[PDB]
Amino acid sequence: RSLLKTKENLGSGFISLFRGKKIDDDLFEELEEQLLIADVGVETTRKIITNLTEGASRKQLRDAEALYGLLKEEMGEILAKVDEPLNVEGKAPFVILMVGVNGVGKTTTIGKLARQFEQQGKSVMLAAGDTFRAAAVEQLQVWGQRNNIPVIAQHTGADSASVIFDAIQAAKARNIDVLIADTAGRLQNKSHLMEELKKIVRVMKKLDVEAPHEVMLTIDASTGQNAVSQAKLFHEAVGLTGITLTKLDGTAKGGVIFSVADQFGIPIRYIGVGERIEDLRPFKADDFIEALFAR
């Protein structure tokens, strides 16, 4: 599958580690190491190991090979807890606030997401709320134009929340089903980001007390621990309702999906396993685990 690189250490990769081995602390240490190198993280790895030890003992397993099935079980539960799909229907418009750092995929994810919704029969409108990042504003505009998707964009530096308020206002008038709004992502000024996003979320209430219907964080799987810290940061700034993991193909640090799931508990909406529009796959825990573990 596309997850071929993460499989060296996770899922299928466990088999080679367990081959012929007996169950002792030496083995759990070897596994712990593999999990940490895979970016599962200290806390999640400590949790996985203990659960697995209690399980391998209270079922009297002396054979290491059998841990593959028990790993599949506990890691499956971790992803299952954040397996709630994004349902963007019944609103006018359904506002998705896209938060996250620059160069993490946001603008690209926005384009892919818009194409997917339109492919389902719903009109989309974009809002360039990252008003200072002139490259990103430009990108959404030219792209939206050639895709016949209205893009609400204003002068460089205009108040983000105003652009988005105008975008929501316009969306309601033009009967748009989904409005996807971009935001500025500069962690360099922690509390400014918090106050900025807080203003955005508040100004929205003037036109709809339900907006935003979705606060989506986009993070890059290939940046391992960076993806986790970023999530923690945005988790404390805004009310994240969904997360999107991009660039899962091509990185052996794929275990980060378990770290971001276990530590925050926020629904993983989409998983990026390639560069095509269909590659921004709606996240299904069971399908992911099955492919992670498939020999």
Both tokens of 127, joined, read 């809002």
- Resolution of the structure in the document, Å: 2.2
218: closest CA among 242, 194, 184?
242
User: Where a domain ends, among 64, 84, 104?
Assistant: 84
| Whether residue 167 sits in one domain with residue 60 | no
Both tokens of 37, joined, read 């190198």
Give the domain range for residue 282.
Answer: 85-295
| Whether residue 79 sits in one domain with residue 104 | no
| Whether residue 90 sits in one domain with residue 76 | no
Structural domain total, the chain: 2
Q: Which helix (H) or strand (E) holds 160?
A: helix 160-173
Give Cα separations from 103 to 100, 109, 191, 220, 250 (angstroms). Answer: 9, 11, 21, 9, 17
Question: CA-to-CA distance for 227 and 104, rounded, in angstroms?
Answer: 9
| Whether residue 112 sits in one domain with residue 33 | no
Q: How far is CA 136 from the centre of its chain?
A: 20
The residue with tokens 């841990």 is 67
Q: 108: annotated binding-site residue?
A: no
Question: CA-to-CA distance for 155 and 167, rounded, in angstroms?
Answer: 14
Helix 67-80 to helix 42-57 angle (10° resolution) is 130
Sign of the CA dihedral 228, 233, 234, 240? positive
Strand ranges for 106-177 from DSSP E:
124-127, 151-152
Q: 81: annotated binding-site residue?
A: no
Q: 72: annotated binding-site residue?
A: no
User: Where a domain ends, among 26, 55, 84?
Assistant: 84
231: closest CA among 41, 33, 11?
41
User: What are 59-63's contacts with CB under 8 Å, separation 24+?
Assistant: 61/23, 62/22, 62/23, 63/22, 63/23
Helix 42-57 to helix 256-264 angle (10° resolution) is 90
| Whether residue 74 sits in one domain with residue 91 | no
At 115, give phi and psi (nearest 5°): -60, -40
| Whether residue 261 sits in one domain with residue 184 | yes
| Whether residue 269 sits in one domain with residue 170 | yes
Question: CA-to-CA distance for 187 and 90, rounded, in angstroms?
Answer: 34
Q: 249: annotated binding-site residue?
A: yes
User: Where a domain ends, among 56, 84, 112?
Assistant: 84
10: closest CA among 271, 278, 259?
259
Give Cα separations from 21 to 16, 63, 190 (angstroms). Answer: 10, 7, 48
- Yes or no: say if 122 and 250 are a contact pair by the CB < 8 Å rule: no
Both tokens of 168, joined, read 């929501």
Q: Which helix (H) or strand (E) holds 219?
A: strand 214-220
Q: 251: annotated binding-site residue?
A: no
| Whether residue 231 sits in one domain with residue 100 | yes
263: closest CA among 249, 243, 247?
243
Sign of the CA dihedral 266, 135, 154, 113? negative
The residue with tokens 């935001």 is 183
| Whether residue 146 sits in one domain with residue 28 | no
Q: 184: annotated binding-site residue?
A: yes
Give Cα separations from 223 to 31, 142, 230 (angstroms). Answer: 22, 29, 10
Question: CA-to-CA distance for 94 and 104, rounded, in angstroms?
Answer: 23
Q: 102: annotated binding-site residue?
A: yes
127: closest CA among 91, 174, 160?
160
Q: Which helix (H) or strand (E) holds 142?
A: helix 134-146
Give Cα separations from 214 to 118, 220, 242 (angstroms). Answer: 18, 19, 7
Q: 105: annotated binding-site residue?
A: yes
Question: CA-to-CA distance for 235 and 251, rounded, in angstroms?
Answer: 24
What type of residue is 12?
A: S
Q: For residue 64, what is the domain's CATH number?
A: 1.20.120.140
Q: 107: annotated binding-site residue?
A: yes
183: closest CA among 207, 205, 150, 161?
161
Percent composition of the chain: helix, strand, coil (DSSP 3-state, to 5): 50, 15, 35
Question: CA-to-CA distance for 195 and 25, rounded, in angstroms?
Answer: 48
Q: 59: annotated binding-site residue?
A: no
| Whether residue 50 sits in one domain with residue 124 | no
| Whether residue 72 sits in one domain with residue 99 | no
The strand pairing partners of 270, in sequence order, are 244, 282
Q: 183: annotated binding-site residue?
A: yes
Q: For residue 187, what is the domain's CATH number?
A: 3.40.50.300
| Whether residue 101 sits in one domain with residue 68 | no
